């Protein structure tokens, strides 16, 4: 499995062999912009299983 990793979540950054399907999380950095044109970046955290 060729997966994604890193701080802005680049692709092809962590090759692995088994699939972990547990309640982990991964964190991403999202740059967005509002209706007032305020550019601002986020840090989120994603509980998945």
């Amino acid at each position: 499995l060729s997966l994604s990793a890193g701080r802005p979540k680049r692709p092809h950054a962590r090759r692995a062999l088994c699939l972990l399907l547990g309640p982990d999380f991964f964190t991403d950095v999202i740059t967005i912009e509002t209706a007032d044109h305020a550019r601002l970046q986020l840090q989120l955290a994603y509980n998945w299983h």
């Binding site: 060729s2 692709p11 092809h12 090759r15």
Partner: protein
Amino acid sequence: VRAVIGSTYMLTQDEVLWEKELPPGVEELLNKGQDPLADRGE
């Protein structure tokens, strides 16, 4: 010419080995790119 696949084989009388050539670039796809689900990145 045919393909004999499976068990071990001794060439009988009047049989020789044939060479299968491939179009250019196809050998580069066979040896380099092993698993296109794996290394499809490049």
